[PDB]
Every structure is written in C-alpha cells, then in structure tokens.
A paper describes a structure:
LRRK2 is a large multidomain protein with 2,527 amino acids (286 kDa) and consists of armadillo repeats (ARM), ankyrin repeats (ANK), leucine-rich repeats (LRR), Ras of complex (ROC), C-terminal of ROC (COR), kinase domain (KD), and the Trp-Asp-40 (WD40) domain. The C-terminal WD40 domain of LRRK2 is required for LRRK2-induced neurotoxicity and has been shown to mediate the interaction of LRRK2 with microtubules and synaptic vesicles. The structure reveals a canonical seven-bladed WD40 fold and a surprising dimeric state in the crystal. We found that the WD40 domain forms dynamic dimers in solution, and both structure-based mutations and PD-associated disease variants in the WD40 domain mainly impair its dimerization.
Here, we report the crystal structure of human LRRK2 WD40 domain determined at 2.6-Å resolution. We determined the WD40 domain crystal structure using the single wavelength anomalous diffraction (SAD) method and refined it to 2.6-Å resolution. The ordered part of the structure extends from residue 2,142 to residue 2,498 and has a few gaps, and the last 30 residues in the construct are disordered. The first six blades run from β2–β5, β6–β9, β10–β13, β14–β17, β18–β21, and β22–β25 continuously, and the last and seventh blade contains β26–β28 and β1 from the N-terminal end to complete the fold, forming a stabilized ring-like structure. There are two WD40 domain monomers in the crystallographic asymmetric unit, which are related by an almost perfect twofold axis (176.3°). The interactions are centered at blade V but also involve the surrounding structures as well as blade IV and VI. The dimerization interface is large and buries approximately ∼1,200 Å2 surface area per monomer. In addition to surface area burial, a number of potential hydrogen bonding and salt bridge interactions exist, among D2388 of one subunit and H2391 and S2345 of the symmetric subunit, among R2394 of one subunit and main chain atoms of M2408 and Y2410 of the symmetric subunit, and between E2395 of one subunit and Y2346 of the symmetric subunit. Notably, the WD40 domain mutation G2385R is located at the dimerization interface and compromised dimerization. Therefore, the WD40 domain dimer observed in the crystal is also a bona fide dimer in solution, instead of a crystallization artifact.
Author numbering:
A (entry chain A): 2141 to 2158, 2164 to 2253, 2259 to 2305, 2314 to 2395, 2408 to 2462, 2468 to 2477, 2488 to 2496
B (entry chain B): 2141 to 2159, 2165 to 2251, 2260 to 2304, 2314 to 2395, 2408 to 2420, 2424 to 2476, 2488 to 2498
Write the structure that this text describes.
C-alpha cells in the first residue's frame, strides 16, 4: 500500500489502468487533456488531445492485430480514439448527440464498447469498429431523455439511467427496467429521488445515488427493495455526511464504500455488515476500482492535491 | 402554551395527570418518592412512599363508590395504592417477581407489565383490596425481555409486539428484529420502549433514531422514519424518546420535536432546541372537554413541563 501524489492542482475526472500505469482525464481544464502516470516511477505526462473536457475513459484491447486503443469520451460528445504505442495514430468515432458520460468494455465471444451519453442514450460499438475513423455504432438505445444522464454500467449488463436501473443482454434489448424513485420502506425519500451514480452487481443490485448516504439494495427478480445500508449509521459507530461517492466489490463477499469524506467502509455481503473502517483516508474519496488483484483509490485534498493510493 | 419549572434537580421518571394537577414519580432518588404538582399554582409537594424507586404511575378511578386511587409501581415490584383524597388510606397489592415497568388503565382493568416479561391484570374493583391478587398473569417474555409499553391492546416486550383483547389470549406476536435488513441492524436489535397505534404500529426502540412502522395484518414492516435525516433538513443523535399521536409527535434525545403527517409521511413542523432533552410527551384530560398536551423535558438539572391546548 503506497500513496502517489499527482502534480499540484491536477483534478482527475476519470481513470483507467493498464511498469504498470494509468490513463487520466483531467478536470482542471475546459479542454480535453489526457494524462499518463507510471505507477512504478510516479512519472506524470499530459497532452491536450480534444476540444472539450474528457469525462470518461475506456481501454479497447484487440488481442488479434496486437493493438491497444485508449478511448476518450468528452463533454461535447466526441469519441477520440488514440493508439497506445504510436500517439500519431488517432481518429474520432461518430459524434454523440450529447456529452459522453460512461465508457464500458463488455464481452459476449464478442467484445464491445458501450457508450452512455448525457441524454439517456446508450451507443454500442463492436470491438473492431473502434479502429475506423468516423465509425458508427451498431445500435443506439434511447433509455432516457436529456434530464436522465446514463452514468454507470456494470456486469448480462446492468446500468443506471436517472432513477432507473436497466438490464440488457446479447440482442441489446432492454429486458429489465426498475424505477427506484419510490419505495415505502425508504428510510428517507429525498435521497432516493436522485440520479444513480454507480451500480455494482452481485446476488442483488447495490446502487448509490447523487448526494445520498444510503446504498439501496434491489432484487433482480422481484424488482423491489431488498435492503438499505445507511453509511451515516455505520460511520457513527459524528457530524459525517456519509454521502456515497463510489462503490467497489471484492472477490465475492466484501463491498468497499468511499464516502464524501475520506472514509472507506468494507462491509460483508452474506450474513453480517461491517468488516473494516478507515477514517480520514483522505479528504474526499473520488474513484475506487480494482485492476489486474490490486486496489486503486483516487482521492483529493483541498489549491488541490489529488492522490492515488494503491495496494 | 406555558412552561412550569420544577424544583431544581428534580428528575421525573413517570407522570400521570388528573383533574388541574399531575402526579410524578421521582428519579433523583433511590427510594420511592411520589410528588404532586398543581398546574394552576405551580405548587410542588413530595413524599417518600416506597422503599425503591417509583418506575410507573397509574390512576384508577371508580365512578361508582366515587373513589380515585393512585397506583405506583416500583423497582422492587411493589404496587402501592394510595387514596387521592385521604393519603392515610394506602395499601399494597401482590408483590411482582420483578420490577414494575408498565402501568396502564384499560369493565375496567389495571395492566401491570414487569421487567421479567410478565403482564398481570387486575380488575377495576380489586385495586381497593389489600394484598389483592391479579385475575391473570401472562408470561410473554423472560427476565431479559422487559415489558415496557402498552397502548384491542397492543404492547411491547423486548423486540416483540404483542396483542390481546379479552385478557386470556395473546393474539399477535410479531418479531421486530427482522427489520435488520433495512436502514440499520443494531437499532432494530433493541427493546421496544413506546408503541402508538393508529392504522399501523409506530414503535421506537431504546437508543435508536429510527421509528419503525409495522402492519397489523401482514405483520411486516410498512416503513421507516429516520429522525437523523429529517433533523438534518448536524451532529444530532436523533435518539427517539417519545411518540405521540394527534399527525405524529416525536421527541428526540436532544431538545428536538418533530411533527410528521401519517397519511403522507411528510414533515409538518420541527421545533429545534425545545429543551436539552425531551423525556415524556402525552395527552391528558384536565377536566370536562379539556384536551391538553404535556411535554416533560430537562436541561445541574432543570426539569420543565410545557403545556398547551390541542
């Protein structure tokens, strides 16, 4: 477990891992700046590659043809594809009608690039088609509207659009559509009327909402509330907001929760709840993800100092 | 609405009103101290009447024979009955096997819940007889599940809600620990301290900021009210101490009082820092057509009784 300090005032919007290194989208700038961080040497390099802020990143790897492409989704809707080995090899896919708010690589075996936009749409690209300039998506799913951003995808595929959880499979048709805005069992109603920010898929669906300390648990079959995890009460065992910022699952049993503060919770998902709790791990946990085995946690302190902890 | 300051360092464990004045059990003392407060003159008098702390009060009124008796249940299990008009008329009913933790007036009956999970029933008249035995004793729980609230009659024993109507059968027996799946597990694993019955059951648990709402028929959770989250619209504990129906009043461990709607579970009113700690909140009839709201709080201790009309 070591901490890697990023250059001062660097803000990280998005992050993807691959001498291990990571690609970063920068949020301290209104244009599209792509950064590269060597985890072994802690070296940081960046380049302006697009006209609008890079919101989300995805790494498309082609085992045949031996090529890795880094895909940047931007605030203007542009999908910029850049070659990992030769930066002079870069092009743009079809422009989205709104900002790109989600990038996921799925596999069905066929691999795909799923592109969620801010106007509630989900564009699907095939593995190979990412190499082609001006490439069009195989299909576009109109799941929401301009007011329901599609912000998270997890793996059948589950996703969050506004206050709705959606599911889709091979044919890319929306099978399950679950409205989470209403439930009589809600400990508090105002938290549940927020956009879903993250979805982790285990035996049940564990979702988090914007500016909400309550992780909701919904059932895949019955499409109803399974349970509630109130981070405020777990933290208090006292002025913590408990606002959930990120969810990360372990091998099978454990769930990491990064809160608005620097607090990280580790709960068991089988018969009890609380395993571990680290207070003031940073000032604010922003991103938490697994990579290949390894745990990456991006937090920031505030001038702004972003840090990447890894164990 | 007017507030009456009790003498300094007086602690009120239990409370019952009559017509206006109130009877108080004192908690600042290890023996059984009964106090009397005139709501018109704010005059306070007290007397040591028992050997152990008076935990509960009940006022048995007999319309025929025209007699009012004040019954005190104590920490040793003693049930002391005293005449309202003549204090020299006092006696003791059958000793309970453990401390008396609940006294309710319900043909009229006196229900006596104890700390070892038992409920003794006395008839209206039998309260006048020295050493009188109860009509029946229901063993609902055990030494570890005290019976602490009564409100058909519903009651709370440990983490279980029980029901009974004609005194010889426990009708409903509902385990409320099952709500571990929602909001918080440690809060739901606590003894029920108060129960209010309107259409669903609104229960509160010891050291819990979550008022649970259960269904009478399906015997399952209807909803949850988290006082911490309602108060935050910041270090408030939100620990519920008292529930009252009017709308639902909630007095918290702090000095905070919430007034929520039932049909819609929406927030009507919120009074912050009403005192340092709300302890009791109840309705009383101070005379003919006189419905009144009494709130006992405390603030080195200063207990106060706020009183307003409904």
């Amino acid at each position: 477990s070591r901490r890697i300090l990023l250059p001062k005032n660097v803000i990280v919007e998005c992050m993807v891992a691959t001498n291990a290194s990571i690609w970063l989208g920068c949020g301290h700038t209104d244009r599209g700046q792509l950064s590269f961080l060597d985890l072994n040497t802690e070296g940081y390099t960046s380049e302006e590659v697009a006209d609008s802020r890079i919101l989300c990143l995805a790494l498309v790897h082609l085992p045949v043809e031996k090529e890795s492409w880094i895909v940047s989704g931007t605030q203007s809707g542009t999908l910029l594809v850049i070659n990992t080995e030769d930066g002079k090899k870069r092009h743009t896919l079809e422009k989205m009608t709104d900002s790109v708010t989600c990038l996921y690589c799925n596999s069905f075996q066929k691999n795909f690039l799923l592109v969620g936009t801010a106007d509630g749409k989900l564009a699907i690209f095939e593995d190979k088609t990412v190499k082609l300039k001006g490439a069009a998506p195989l299909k576009i799913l109109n799941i929401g509207n301009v007011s329901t951003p599609l912000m998270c995808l997890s793996e059948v595929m589950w996703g969050g659009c506004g206050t709705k959880i959606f599911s889709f499979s091979n044919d890319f048709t929306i099978q399950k559509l679950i409205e989470t805005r209403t439930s009589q069992l809600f400990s508090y109603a105002a938290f549940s009327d927020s956009n879903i920010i993250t979805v982790v898929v285990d035996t049940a669906l564990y979702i988090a909402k914007q500016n909400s300390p309550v992780v909701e648990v919904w059932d895949k079959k019955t499409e109803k509330l399974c349970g509630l995890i109130d981070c405020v009460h777990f933290l208090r065992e006292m002025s913590y907001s408990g606002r959930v910022k990120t969810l990360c699952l372990q091998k099978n049993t454990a769930l990491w929760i990064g809160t608005g503060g620097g607090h990280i919770l580790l709960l068991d998902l089988s018969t009890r709840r609380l395993i571990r709790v680290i207070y003031n791990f940073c000032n604010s946990v922003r991103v938490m993800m697994t990579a290949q085995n390894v745990m990456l946690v991006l937090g920031y302190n505030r001038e702004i100092q972003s840090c990447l902890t890894v164990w």
